[PDB]
Curated annotation (Swiss-Prot):
A motif (Nucleolar localization signal) lies at residues 31-35. Changing residue 8 to A: Significantly decreases binding affinity for RNH1. It comes from Homo sapiens. This is Angiogenin. Changing residue 13 to R: Found in a patient with Parkinson disease; uncertain significance. Disulfide bonds join 26-81, 39-92, 57-107.
Length: 123
């Protein structure tokens, strides 16, 4: 059962609810989702309902975007953890960046499997 890619999607881009959304939340969760040895340079988590996400995969909450990317109709609460310093080696210090924006993903068999991680950057 399940999609090992979607659960890879879930594993690193989803967190139902964070009682906190600061830098210490970022340095905690990233480490706890096996994202620190090495340190991911930038990672974004999505909060809230898990189905308002699978919906992006279909018309009810998602519109075609760029090449194969789909973009959501509803905006989402998000926490972007930007590595700090540059060394891929721990300790990995992050700076969170909470926002309210729509996510852009890639679906496979109606399930999100990829996250366009660059839209969440600061050019």
């Amino acid at each position: 059962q399940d999609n090992s890619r979607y659960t890879h999607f879930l594993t690193q881009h989803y967190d139902a609810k964070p009682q906190g959304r600061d830098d210490r939340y970022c340095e905690s969760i990233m480490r706890r989702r096996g994202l620190t040895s090495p340190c991911k340079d930038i990672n974004t988590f999505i909060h809230g309902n898990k189905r308002s996400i699978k919906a992006i995969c279909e018309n009810k909450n998602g519109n075609p975007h760029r090449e194969n990317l789909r973009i959501s109709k509803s905006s989402f609460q998000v926490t972007t953890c930007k590595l700090h310093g540059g060394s891929p080696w721990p300790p990995c210090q992050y700076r969170a960046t909470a926002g309210f924006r729509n996510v852009v993903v890639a679906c496979e068999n109606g399930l999100p499997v990829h996250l366009h991680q660059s839209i969440f950057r600061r050019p």
